[PDB]
Design a protein around this nucleic acid. Sequence first.
RNA 1: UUCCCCACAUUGACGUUCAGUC
RNA 2: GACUGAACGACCAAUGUGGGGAA
Lengths: 397, 394
Amino acid sequence: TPSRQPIPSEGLQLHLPQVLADAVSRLVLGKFGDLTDNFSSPHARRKVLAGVVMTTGTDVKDAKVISVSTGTKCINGEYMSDRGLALNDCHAEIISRRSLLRFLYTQLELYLNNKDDQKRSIFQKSERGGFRLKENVQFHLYISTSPCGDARIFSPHEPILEEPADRHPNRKARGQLRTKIESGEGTIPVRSNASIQTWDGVLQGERLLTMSCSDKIARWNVVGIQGSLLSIFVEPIYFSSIILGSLYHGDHLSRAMYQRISNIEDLPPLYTLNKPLLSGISNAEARQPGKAPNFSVNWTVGDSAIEVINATTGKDELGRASRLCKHALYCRWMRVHGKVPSHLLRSKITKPNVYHESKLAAKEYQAAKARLFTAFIKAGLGAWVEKPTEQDQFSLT
Amino acid sequence: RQPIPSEGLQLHLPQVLADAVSRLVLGKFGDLTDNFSSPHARRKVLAGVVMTTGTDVKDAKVISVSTGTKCINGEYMSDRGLALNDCHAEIISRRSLLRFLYTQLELYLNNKDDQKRSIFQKSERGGFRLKENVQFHLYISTSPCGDARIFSPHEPILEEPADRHPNRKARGQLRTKIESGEGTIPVRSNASIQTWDGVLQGERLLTMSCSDKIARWNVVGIQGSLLSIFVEPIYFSSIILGSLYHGDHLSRAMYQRISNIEDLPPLYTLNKPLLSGISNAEARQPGKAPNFSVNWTVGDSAIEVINATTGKDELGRASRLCKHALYCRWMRVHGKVPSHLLRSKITKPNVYHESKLAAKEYQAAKARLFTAFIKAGLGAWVEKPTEQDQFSLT
RNA sequence: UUCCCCACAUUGACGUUCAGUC
RNA sequence: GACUGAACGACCAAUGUGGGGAA
Ligand SMILES: O=P(O)(O)O[C@H]1[C@H](OP(=O)(O)O)[C@@H](OP(=O)(O)O)[C@H](OP(=O)(O)O)[C@@H](OP(=O)(O)O)[C@H]1OP(=O)(O)O
Ligand SMILES: O=P(O)(O)O[C@H]1[C@H](OP(=O)(O)O)[C@@H](OP(=O)(O)O)[C@H](OP(=O)(O)O)[C@@H](OP(=O)(O)O)[C@H]1OP(=O)(O)O
Ligand SMILES: [Zn+2]
Ligand SMILES: [Zn+2]
């Protein structure tokens, strides 16, 4: 099956694709096991499993499971947080990325902690200013099934024939932006009659829109996985690899993960359209039809236990904010910002100490973001949907 | 468990008609299976459609015959429409009926000497209509899943064991077949809409029950959207059950539960067909229920056997009943029909969903129906993800 | 009549074993 | 391998009946 064969990376090829895929799938699944009393725990129940793994060199056993997560559902509109205490998106892979961020903050704290630790940190000072990764370190993303949104919209028991080389005899656009529908694991296209969300309107019962994971990952393949805030310290980090435990299709997946916005232009220095290794695994999971657990589990290496969050409310069953919510990450960030000398910043601590404004200090990441949004529009693939601005207006302590 | 008569001038004898169409359908299934000895003669449920052309109960023709009890698996849904999503017998029988209707249109438009033989004729209102004596009667070897069958799935012991609890909330409720589970469940508990990737990920594919679907045929007609562009709404005159008949449940399910429907467009109405069990009720069919579903339309040489799990035949080939096939038929007739003869002349692109939307009135009827159910507190209709009907003919 | 709680039944997938057909 | 069939085990989320309550 030409549809069921690995797509090599436009990054660094340090391992062979299939050994790497089977490796990270095996490790992540194993580490979730260890975190759950050998899959016996109540919180081992899941529909989609994801994780992030790190490699330091060509030795494919140099690997570390960085983070592990499960989840297939999104916050209710009615339940959003004004102080950023809620998790808007608890799909497995989104959560994994967020935990990965915690690992990145810990690694900066490690470097800046003392000098003897700097040899142990994944980071180093960067010649261009700020920090950069060590010369060989790569991260790999694993999802137990293809990401929601465009990567999954296809008939897995029918041969592919999407777009012939000649201009489609009918019409174009087979990459459209799609959103999670509130109260569902599913995804629907974006309206071309695009109205924006408001804060008190959505809170009343109007549709909560969250971009699909396919669209989110593409975003990660343009602006990097660190997000805005961290980019003030560090240079853009991209996934080198994307491994799927099931529903793998090279044509569709390469389309969704980068190929559909290949018309992107004017990306700032260090930014690029990252085309990672794509691959499924040798022994793919079977579809289990049945109820998807209402919770989302997350773990970052260093942690003792996993954390269990009610996807609907974005907080845990006792209503306590997660270590992953905006407020928490801002906390980690503020701490790092304090431990970091001002001549070592990638941009300037100019703006106020509210979340959104501190995001705007990342001028370049912001610029990349705009090129991205524009890329989707000109590609005839729909306009991105952002949360209402009130979501990001809060302070700490 | 006694037949419920139809309209305001009675054209056939009830029990004679029931016994007639049951005998006929079951018999033609016989001829088609070399007297029930055939490999694919095994069945759990049988359905068929019979046409009558006049009162002479030997003027009857068996139009379609079918068997099947299962719905497609999630992984096997087709984005090109090559799959049969629902293979419960009576659903398939309706689809076979459609093939017959398309064929009749083709026959009418073929030439002038043939128009006399087609069941259709021009309508004063534009498009086509059935000739004045033509009726279709639906036969199922058992009560349709959903509202007619969920309560009292067993032979009535007669004595008129009428429902001891007719006013529960559960009565008349819309219900859906759930993938990987038994029974048929309210939609009120399934509040969100279906998605393609959600189903593919493992969320259970929901298919509307047969009871609800037939009620639907009793409002928007059995020809469906696409054919309604050519012809005026056609209804089943009779619904005959080879077993498990309970008049109260069947009548509630087939129409009475939506008698609150309003603003139906012209020619559309709440059809109340003849309901009846038969003289000699069928025996339960012994065995594991077969994974295949059989269909035959009058005219055909052979029957077709479709894998209910996959929606395609034993070799992975598309059925003559799938969306794609029917669209093909519709497109051919569409070209052969002069535009002054269409019931709707709104022009739309040649993708399936879009071509369905050209049936503006039918579409409207559909809306009155969904609302009827909703305001009656009987739940919201559940549709396939919107992706299912976005395909063209290559 | 309708609901509630408990108990017992009823009605498409899965696994095991056994027999077959291409 | 696919399909076909007969047993046995474990599900599925509705539904029935009963006893007991309640409006
Ligand atoms: O990982 P996610 O759950 O998708 O969170 C992201 C993330 O928000 P936080 O990092 O503040 O949690 C984005 O922030 P960046 O790091 O990319 O800046 C933000 O984008 P903006 O901050 O540019 O607005 C986007 O929110 P949205 O695109 O809806 O405004 C939001 O996604 P969710 O809102 O789906 O969480
Ligand atoms: O006999 P069925 O198997 O139930 O097929 C019908 C039929 O679809 P096709 O004729 O295209 O196969 C309906 O179309 P109409 O002819 O009634 O318009 C369609 O309804 P919509 O056109 O309103 O979408 C409905 O699908 P659904 O109602 O679930 O969207 C679908 O039934 P299944 O989807 O269960 O096959
Ligand atoms: Zn997702
Ligand atoms: Zn049925």
